[PDB]
């Protein structure tokens, strides 16, 4: 019975971690864009449209 509970809980935890990794990657992409905007639009004057 313990083996059954362990396998189940372990799988639920591994699923959680996977989702966190994917979400973190998307946040990283957002942060990179934010860094570019700060660099080009605040510390200077961007000319590219929109």
């Amino acid at each position: 019975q313990i083996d059954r509970l362990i396998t189940g809980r372990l799988q639920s935890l591994q699923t959680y971690v996977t989702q966190q990794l994917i979400r973190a990657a998307e946040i990283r992409a957002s942060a990179n864009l934010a860094a570019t905007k700060m660099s080009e639009c605040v510390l200077g004057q961007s000319k590219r449209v929109d």
Binding site: G8, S12, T15, D50
Partner: protein
């Protein structure tokens, strides 16, 4: 449509819900992508004859 298979499935927690939610998220993201790429203009201009 298997009653017993359901009964047993309910003992594994909320896996089913979490999966369904993830697929709903990607599905609404696709409509967001098409909206952001194309709907960049406010008016529908017409071609001069």
């Amino acid at each position: 449509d298997s009653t017993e298979c359901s009964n047993l499935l309910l003992q594994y927690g909320s896996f089913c819900t979490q999966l369904n939610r993830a697929l709903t998220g990607i599905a609404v993201e696709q409509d967001k992508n098409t909206q952001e790429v194309f709907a960049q203009v406010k008016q529908i201009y017409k071609t001069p004859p």
